[PDB]
Structures are given as structure tokens and as C-alpha cells.
Amino acid sequence: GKRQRMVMKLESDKTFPIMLEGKINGYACVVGGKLFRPMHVEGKIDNDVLAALKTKKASKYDLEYADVPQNMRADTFKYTHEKPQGYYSWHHGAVQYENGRFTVPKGVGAKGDSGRPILDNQGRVVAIVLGGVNEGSRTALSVVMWNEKGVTVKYTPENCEQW
Amino acid sequence: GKRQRMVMKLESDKTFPIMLEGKINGYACVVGGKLFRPMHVEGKIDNDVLAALKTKKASKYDLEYADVPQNMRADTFKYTHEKPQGYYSWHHGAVQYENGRFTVPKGVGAKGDSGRPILDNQGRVVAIVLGGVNEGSRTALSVVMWNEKGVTVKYTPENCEQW
Amino acid sequence: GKRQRMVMKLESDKTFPIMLEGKINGYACVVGGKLFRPMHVEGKIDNDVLAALKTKKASKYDLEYADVPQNMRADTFKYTHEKPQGYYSWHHGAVQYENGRFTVPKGVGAKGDSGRPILDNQGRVVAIVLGGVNEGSRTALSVVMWNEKGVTVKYTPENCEQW
Amino acid sequence: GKRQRMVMKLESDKTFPIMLEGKINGYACVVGGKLFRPMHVEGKIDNDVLAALKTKKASKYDLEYADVPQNMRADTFKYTHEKPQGYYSWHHGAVQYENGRFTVPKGVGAKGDSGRPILDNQGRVVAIVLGGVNEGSRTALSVVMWNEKGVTVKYTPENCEQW
């Protein structure tokens, strides 16, 4: 109920969709002065400022990143590495964090909702949704996250389908 | 209030947008049996009749022009050269004509609203908006117009940005 | 009235419009387990299932035509060889059938009107509209249809327009 | 629900389940004075007299025909060849017969319900269900039946699964 409204209030201005002949196939992320955007989502950036840049690539970690200018670094997402197990907020409701794995209940999940960040009860991004795999009743996510040392860890289960 | 409604009633059928993969970047003008369309706005004409033609180019004046057929010349805009100083109607409200210069108050003006004609209190096109430059609080326009002799004069201030 | 509403209920499920860049150019019909598409209409079928299927062409009868997948075979239209004189249904009102000629009262029928299946007093397709000509105060059509033997028959009046 | 009562009250005397380890795999049908049993169903006949027989094989039509003793020739299904279009009465409700094909609405039809007869509004067997394939919202059936000449005909749709 109110969780989706809080997601729409937090991700209103900072989330920009990716257009491809009128089709919405992905979402970029503006956090820490960086613009995260995946490889398989191909299209034009809806924002005029973020589209006229050059994104350095990382095909192993499946991420394109760039440098957000200084006049927009204050209006970004927050990020942290301290995460316990339990529940977190996602755009379609809740997501479970168990044994270092993000799980989403079924019914939701198609092609197009790639790049949506995972939020917490405070308002900090803990993961970035990149892919998903159907596991019985409860699907698992293939995402990226950080740690205490500062190494971007990409978690990928078996036989995932890119969204 | 009612000025925008009069602009929408006058520019309903005669104004056709320019599409580029679903994005509206410019507007052509059908006046005097001629189809005015700028250089920097690139895309396909939404009208089926106006798209299957050949437009003669003028890069110095920044105008492509063509010949509207006789079955559509009655449903065009009006044009004149007699203009006093003061106020005129524009799609986002009012525009000031002072010292032979068109000025628009700030807050409005982005990439995409190029080619909108400037109307008067009677319903005649006096100028065609091509570009704009931010001057203090009140922006100036880089437009084209006519005169009593019949020479198309292009007015361009310093350091303009094309829209 | 009443006749057009059940036709809208049928066309919402099985008649699929094509996707030109901003508009609709034609309508793919799914009848008997064989997808039909007119040739002069160019674009993309709205379903991603019906888009990937490669079509065979029949230039004498102006129709691309491929085979529909096995799940979709029950959810197709039905076709009838026997048509008596009188009144049949169509998306734009009613259509007269007289001396083997599907004719329509004028004012309707233009570009983007192609592949619309002419239904009957039961809900079965008897013809597929490909265009027509204005025969005075009442326009006739250029349809393909079927006969008792199982032979696709195309009728076309003089100087028809590919709608 | 009234037709299903008729089917159950006619199957209570003349239909025998083929049990393997107690689990139902198929149904022997005693129609017209001759025992019928499909090939791929494994198990034994529930009736003790019918289980001690020498069923002659017929591997093409997926049937194992036998003969009925003379004291049991009156306790058989009656049958016919006459089959106009419309509805017939299966074990789970109704079954549509259109264009020479028996179709059931989906969901029902799994491993075990094979060999069940299809009845008419008089109480005569017109088909014996062997298998079928799910064509989306409706399941076509692979049955054997008869004709006016007195010839056993098997119909088989594409990619049918043996039930």
C-alpha cells in the first residue's frame, strides 16, 4: 500500500527510463555521482543531460558507469554496506534477504523491469536488480552489491534470464 | 488562460509535429502554400501528405521550404508584415516585441519547442521561433520574419542555443 | 447501434492492428489457424508471438500468410463459404452484399482500413477488406473470400485504392 | 450436471478401470459386444471375467479388441455412427464436436482418463477417448470412431499426448 507510494516518492526525479522506439526496457540509477546502466538494455536516455556523456564499460560486472556533474551530486540516491537479513522494500512491494540472497515471490517479473534499485526502511540503496531466475514458488535475483572493503560483488544464481 | 486555448484552436490542424523514434523535437509550419521546417530538427513528418515531398534547402536562413498543393492552400496560416511594438501571443502565453526583438520571460524554454509560430491579436503569423538565448531574467529569441519589401530577415542574437 | 459492439468484442481478442511508427496502417486477422496480413501495409504486428513468424507471400491475392502456433489455434475466427444476399457486419457499421459485391455507404473507408474481417449474422468471417473505390454515392470494396470448393477468390472493382 | 449423471449411471455398469498398483491408468469399454482396451495403458481389468481373456492386439489404432461372452452381450453399450455438429456428453461434462474433431474446454485431461466413451443425447457411444493435446483455451482429442460405411476410423491431431 504505502510502500509503493514511498518508492514512487523516493524514485520520482532520480530514476530515468530507457526508451527504445517508445518501449520502456530498463531504468538507470544515479547514485554517488555515478550513472549505473546495464549492457543488455539498449536505447536512448530520456534525460537530456545524462544522454550526452560517455559511459565506461564493464562487461564482467555487467555495468556501464559515468561521472555525474557536481550540480546534481546532491540529488542522488544514498548507498551503504551494512545490511542485516530480513525484509526490504522493492517497487513491486517487498523482497526477502536470506543467506545473502534476494528472493521475490512469484506473480511479478517480466522483461523491462531491469535496473530498479532495492531500498531499505531508511532510504538507502542496497542492491541493483539486474536479472531473475524462477525457483519453485519464490524467484531469486541476480544483482550487484557492495561490502565493507569496497569491492563490487555480483551475485548470480544458476540459469538466470536477463530482464 | 484563454490565450493558450486560442493558440490550440488556431494551431490544431495546421501544426504537425516532427517525430524521431517517438520523441517530439520540432514543429513545421504550413503558411502561404509553403512548408517551413528547420535544419537541426531531424525526423519524419507526422502528416502523410507533407512527408512525401521534396524540400528545397537554405542553410544560411536555416529553412527548408516546399510547395503545398492547391487543395490545402486555403487551410493555411495567415501572414503579414505590418507589426507594431508591444505584446503578442505565443503558445506558452505572451511574448514582447521591443526594439525589433522578441523577448520571452524565463521559466519556459527547452529542447523541442522549435518551429512554433508567433501570432497576434487578429490571427496572423509574424515570426517563427527557431532559437533562444538566456539574457539575465528575460530571454531573447532568434527568429525569422518578413518586411515591406519582401526580404526574409533572420534575426539572431549573440551565443544562441538551438532548440 | 448494437451490431458494432459484438464486433468490437470479437476484434479486441483476435484482430490485431499493425504498428507503423506513430499510427495504424492495417489489421492482421487470425482465422482458422492461419495468420493473414496484407502486402501494401507495412509495419509490425503488436504481439511478439505473431511478430517472429515468417510469412509466405501470395502476390496474386495481395496477402502474406503464415501458420499460427498450436496454442492459438482454438482462439481463431471461423470462415464460411456460403453467403446469401443482404446485410453483413463490419467495424464501421454495416455492409451490403448484392450480386457478389460488398458495398458500403460512403464517407467511411480510408487509409489505415485494411485487413478488417467482414463478419456475418453469426460471428464468422466471410471476407477480408483490402480497399475499394467510390462508386458514386456508395463505395464498393475489393475483398478476398472463399467458395464452396475451398478456393480463395479475390474480387476487385475498377481502379480501386489500396487502403 | 444432468448429462453427467446420465454418463455416470451408464458408466457404473459398463466401464472398468485399469488399475496398476491401485492407481487408475485407463478404462476398458464394453461397446457393441466387444471389449476395448488401449495399448499404452498398463494394469489389469477390474472385472475378473474380463481380465482372464486373450485380447488380440491391433497396434495401429491403439486398441486391444476382444470378444464378449454370450451372457454379457446384452449388457453392452449401444453405439452409432451418426454425428451431426453440436454438443456431446463426456464423463466430465460436455464436449464440442465441430469440423470432425472432439474438443473439451481446458484444464481437464491428464494421465489416466483414457478409454472413456463419449455419449450422445440418446445414450450411444460415438467415440472412445485415447489422448489429446492442449490447443491453448481448448483441448482437441484423439479418438477412434466409426462411419456410415462400417469402418473404424481413428482421428489424431498434431503432437497428441497419450493419456
Q: Is A13 on the interface with B (CB under 8 A)?
A: no
Strand partners, C64: C37, C57
Chain B residues with CB-CB distance to A48 below 8 A = 111
Chain C residues with CB-CB distance to D136 below 8 A = 70-75
Say how many CA atoms lie within 13 Å of C137 toward its Cβ. 0
Q: Is A52 on the interface with B (CB under 8 A)?
A: no
Chain D residues with CB-CB distance to C67 below 8 A = none
Query: Do the beta carbons of residue C142 and residue C132 sit within 8 Å?
Result: yes
Q: Is A24 on the interface with B (CB under 8 A)?
A: no
Q: Where are the alpha helices (DSSP H) in chain A?
A: 2-10, 48-51
Q: How far apart are CA B28 and CA B13, in angstroms?
A: 12
Burial of B5 (0-12, 13-18, 19+ CB in 10 A): exposed
Strand partners, D58: D63
Chains D and B in direct contact, meaning 3 or more beta-carbon pairs closer than 8 angstroms:
no
Collapsing DSSP states into helix, strand and coil, what is residue C127? strand
Q: Is D138 on the interface with C (CB under 8 A)?
A: yes
Angle, CA B153 vertex, CA B4 and CA B145 arms, to 5°: 20
Chain D residues with CB-CB distance to C71 below 8 A = 134-136
For residue A79, the tally of other CB atoms under 10 A from its CB is: 15
DSSP A25: E
- Read off the C-alpha cell for A70: 557536481
Query: Do the beta carbons of residue D26 and residue D64 sit within 8 Å?
Result: no
Q: How far apart are CA B152 and CA B127, in angstroms?
A: 10
Q: Is A148 on the interface with B (CB under 8 A)?
A: no
Question: Which site among B16, B18, B20, B48 would you substitute to test the C interface, given the most C Cβ atoms closer than 10 Å to its Cβ?
Answer: B48
Q: Is D156 on the interface with C (CB under 8 A)?
A: no
- Interface A:B, Cβ pairs < 8 A: 9
Give catalytic status of residue A75 as yes or no: no
Chain C residues with CB-CB distance to D134 below 8 A = 71
Q: Is C158 on the interface with B (CB under 8 A)?
A: no
Q: Which residues contact B53 (CB under 8 A, 6 or more apart)?
A: B35, B66, B67
DSSP D72: G
Residues in chain A: 163
Chains contacting chain A through 3 or more C-beta pairs under 8 A:
B
DSSP B49: H
Question: Which site among C21, C25, C41 would you substitute to test the B interface, given the most B Cβ atoms closer than 10 Å to its Cβ?
Answer: C21
Residue among A139, A147, A148 at smallest CA distance from A157 = A139
Query: Do the beta carbons of residue A161 and residue A131 sit within 8 Å?
Result: yes
For residue B57, the tally of other CB atoms under 10 A from its CB is: 12
Query: Do the beta carbons of residue C94 and residue C3 sit within 8 Å?
Result: yes
Interface contact flag, C74 D136, Cβ < 8 Å = yes
Sheet holding A17-20, edge to edge: A23-27, A17-20, A44-45
Q: How far apart are CA B4 and CA A89, in angstroms?
A: 43
Q: How far apart are CA C46 and CA D80, in angstroms?
A: 47
- Read off the C-alpha cell for B145: 520574419
Residue with cell 471375467: D49
Strand partners, C93: C90
Angle, CA C123 vertex, CA C118 and CA C126 arms, to 5°: 35
- Which method resolved this structure? cryo-EM
Residue type at position D6: M
Q: How far apart are CA D67 and CA B117, in angstroms?
A: 94
Q: Is B84 on the interface with A (CB under 8 A)?
A: no
Query: Do the beta carbons of residue C160 and residue C133 sit within 8 Å?
Result: yes
The alpha-carbon radius of gyration of chain C (Å, integer) is 15
For residue D108, the tally of other CB atoms under 10 A from its CB is: 12
Q: How far apart are CA C117 and CA C130, in angstroms?
A: 10
Q: Is C122 on the interface with D (CB under 8 A)?
A: no
Beta strand pairing status for A29-31 and C56-58?
unpaired
- Read off the C-alpha cell for C135: 462508386
Q: Which contacts (CB < 8 Å, 24+ apart) does range D12-18 have?
A: D13/D75, D14/D75, D14/D76, D14/D77, D15/D116, D15/D117, D16/D45, D16/D46, D16/D47, D16/D50, D17/D46, D18/D42, D18/D43, D18/D44, D18/D45, D18/D46, D18/D115
Residue among B62, B86, B80 at smallest CA distance from B127 = B80
Interface contact flag, C111 B19, Cβ < 8 Å = no
Element housing D10 (H / E): helix D2-14
The alpha-carbon radius of gyration of chain A (Å, integer) is 15
The minimum CA-CA distance between B111 and chain A, rounded to whole Å, is: 9
Give catalytic status of residue A40 as yes or no: yes
Residue among B163, B140, B143 at smallest CA distance from B153 = B143
Collapsing DSSP states into helix, strand and coil, what is residue C72? helix
The alpha-carbon radius of gyration of chain D (Å, integer) is 15
Chain A residues with CB-CB distance to B111 below 8 A = 48
The minimum CA-CA distance between C138 and chain B, rounded to whole Å, is: 23
Collapsing DSSP states into helix, strand and coil, what is residue C128? strand
Residue type at position D31: V
**CA D50 vs CA A153, B139, D66, D117: distances in Å:** 68, 99, 9, 18
Chain B residues with CB-CB distance to A22 below 8 A = 21-22
- Read off the C-alpha cell for D37: 482396451
Beta strand pairing status for C27-30 and B78-79?
unpaired
Is the alpha carbon torsion for D20, D23, D26, D32 positive or negative?
Answer: positive
Chain C residues with CB-CB distance to D135 below 8 A = 70-74
Minimum Cα–Cα distance from B22: chain A residue: A22
Angle, CA A20 vertex, CA A16 and CA A21 arms, to 5°: 125
| Catalytic residue selected from D89, D113, D114, D120 | D114
Q: Is B19 on the interface with C (CB under 8 A)?
A: yes
Sheet holding D34-36, edge to edge: D34-36, D23-31, D15-20, D44-45
Interface contact flag, B48 C111, Cβ < 8 Å = yes
Catalytic sites of B, residue numbers = 40, 62, 114
**CA B76 vs CA B10, B31, B52, B72, B73: distances in Å:** 10, 5, 18, 7, 6
The minimum CA-CA distance between D56 and chain C, rounded to whole Å, is: 36
Residue type at position B8: M
Collapsing DSSP states into helix, strand and coil, what is residue D62? coil
Query: Do the beta carbons of residue A35 and residue A55 sit within 8 Å?
Result: yes
Buried b (16+ CB within 10 A) or exposed e, D37-72: bbbebebebeeeebeebebeeeeebbbbebebeeee
Angle, CA D147 vertex, CA D143 and CA D152 arms, to 5°: 55
Q: Is C110 on the interface with B (CB under 8 A)?
A: no
- Read off the C-alpha cell for A35: 550513472
Q: What are phi and psi of C58, to 5 degrees?
A: -135, 95
Query: Do the beta carbons of residue C75 and residue C13 sit within 8 Å?
Result: yes
- Read off the C-alpha cell for B66: 516546399
Residue among B11, B8, B17 at smallest CA distance from B113 = B17
| Catalytic residue selected from A89, A114, A120, A142 | A114
Query: Do the beta carbons of residue B115 and residue B41 sit within 8 Å?
Result: yes
Burial of D12 (0-12, 13-18, 19+ CB in 10 A): exposed
Minimum Cα–Cα distance from C72: chain D residue: D136
Residue among B63, B60, B160, B146 at smallest CA distance from B104 = B160
Chains B and A in direct contact, meaning 3 or more beta-carbon pairs closer than 8 angstroms:
yes
Query: Do the beta carbons of residue A140 and residue A132 sit within 8 Å?
Result: yes
Question: Which site among D102, D135, D159 would you substitute to test the C interface, given the most C Cβ atoms closer than 10 Å to its Cβ?
Answer: D135
For residue D105, the tally of other CB atoms under 10 A from its CB is: 15
Q: How far apart are CA B64 and CA B30, in angstroms?
A: 12
DSSP B77: B
Q: How far apart are CA A101 and CA A139, in angstroms?
A: 10
Residue type at position C18: I
Burial of D8 (0-12, 13-18, 19+ CB in 10 A): exposed
Q: How far apart are CA D163 and CA D157, in angstroms?
A: 14
